[PDB]
Amino acid sequence: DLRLHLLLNTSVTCNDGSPAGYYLKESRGSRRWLLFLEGGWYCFNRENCDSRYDTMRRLMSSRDWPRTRTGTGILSSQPEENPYWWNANMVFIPYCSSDVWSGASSKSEKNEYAFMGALIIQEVVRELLGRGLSGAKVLLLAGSSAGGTGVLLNVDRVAEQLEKLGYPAIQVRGLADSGWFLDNKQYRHTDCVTITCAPTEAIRRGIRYWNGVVPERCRRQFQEGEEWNCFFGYKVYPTLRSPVFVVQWLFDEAQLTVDNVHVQEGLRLYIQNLGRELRHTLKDVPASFAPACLSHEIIIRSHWTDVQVKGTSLPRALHCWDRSLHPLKGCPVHLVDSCPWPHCNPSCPT
Numbered sequence: 001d002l003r004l005h006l007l008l009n010t011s012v013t014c015n016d017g018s019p020a021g022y023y024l025k026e027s028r029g030s031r032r033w034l035l036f037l038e039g040g041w042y043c044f045n046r047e048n049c050d051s052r053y054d055t056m057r058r059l060m061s062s063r064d065w066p067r068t069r070t071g072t073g074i075l076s077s078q079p080e081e082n083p084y085w086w087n088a089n090m091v092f093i094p095y096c097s098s099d100v101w102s103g104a105s106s107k108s109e110k111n112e113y114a115f116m117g118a119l120i121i122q123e124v125v126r127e128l129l130g131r132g133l134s135g136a137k138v139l140l141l142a143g144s145s146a147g148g149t150g151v152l153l154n155v156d157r158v159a160e161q162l163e164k165l166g167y168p169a170i171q172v173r174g175l176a177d178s179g180w181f182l183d184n185k186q187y188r189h190t191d192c193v194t195i196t197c198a199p200t201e202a203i204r205r206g207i208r209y210w211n212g213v214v215p216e217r218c219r220r221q222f223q224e225g226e227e228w229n230c231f232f233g234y235k236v237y238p239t240l241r242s243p244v245f246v247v248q249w250l251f252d253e254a255q256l257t258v259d260n261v262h263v264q265e266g267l268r269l270y271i272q273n274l275g276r277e278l279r280h281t282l283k284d285v286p287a288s289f290a291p292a293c294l295s296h297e298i299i300i301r302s303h304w305t306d307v308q309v310k311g312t313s314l315p316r317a318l319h320c321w322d323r324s325l326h327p328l329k330g331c332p333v334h335l336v337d338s339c340p341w342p343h344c345n346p347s348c349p350t
């Protein structure tokens with residue numbers, strides 16, 4: 001079990017002004033630290049944030065959080081469940097800012113909600129430095145779904161934070177799971193009039209509502225009013241300096257949802273073209289794992305050890321990545337299926 005700590009800086013808050021926090025399991029022997037960002041979509045105006053507060057309140061508030069959590073998948077401390085990093089220091093950071101971890105805005109007389117995701121990450125890192133992170137050799141910032149996109153938005157800022165604080169020896173790296181989306185043509189169309197709003201338009205509105213922040217080099221490329229581009233992995237990844245491993249199902253359920261897909265020729269060609277386009281964007285990503293499955297998230301699932309690409313599991317590929325950061329015979333790090341239909345890989349989740 002990981003133990004809850006609410007942030008000592010009470011000005012860094014969840015949506016409703018309650019303190020943000022983190023769950024921690026220390027490993028005294030180890031100089032490896034895993035900081036995991038939870039996911040779960042977002043909200044981008046008063047009306048759809050109010051709805052999220054009624055029936056998804058744990059994603060908006062710490063008032064009802066439990067005192068402990070069990071570590072699962074890559075956050076497990078049992079080598080049988082976690083062949084990769086079972087002896088690491090483990091941190092789970094709950095997602096309570098509804099801003100894809102991009103926001104820097106406080107609740108105030110003009111703001112019903114606070115959107116502080118970017119500041120929550122920075123404050124967790126601080127307070128951890130007084131609990132043993134100051135002795136680390138590797139900090140892996142990982143996350144799933146909205147948390148995976150959050151890795152891409154925040155990994156270089158964590159690296160810059162630690163450099164300016166006087167810790168040049170800690171190696172910061174990223175692991176982005178199910179956060180690599182395409183701003184592609186939808187299978188059926190609707191103008192943005194919540195349910196009808198495409199992610200490009202929803203994120204453009206959200207950035208303005210959240211006071212959202214994107215990595216500096218990407219911001220400089222796309223400039224004012226076009227920062228939404230940096231929420232799409234294939235556009236922001238080439239601007240990053242930190243090593244980032246990309247995990248992405250070729251037919252992600254969240255991607256199909258935003259494409260208005262729920263089989264005849266038209267839809268067959270649409271689905272096959274989606275897999276080809278995703279594979280094309282990963283062509284020159286040297287650390288990646290992309291199976292031809294219809295699913296969503298993987299790295300904190302207990303059975304994450306079961307899926308393989310070309311005979312190599314995800315825990316193995318991540319271990320091969322570690323070795324490469326010290327090509328390797330029989331220990332690959334770029335693993336992308338070429339078969340073109342969901343579940344053409346027999347190891348896909350059921």
Ligand SMILES: *[C@@H]1O[C@H](CO)[C@@H](O)[C@H](O)[C@H]1NC(C)=O
Nearest residue numbers: 009010011012119120122123
């Ligand atoms: C608390 O967090 C706020 C928001 O990031 C920051 O401006 C302030 O400096 C922090 N205070 C301390 C004492 O760390």
Ligand SMILES: [NH3+]Cc1cc(-c2ccccc2)no1
Nearest residue numbers: 039040041145146181199231
């Ligand atoms: N939790 C799923 C999720 C997906 C997204 C998302 C992020 C960027 C672009 C399109 C969708 N945000 O959250």
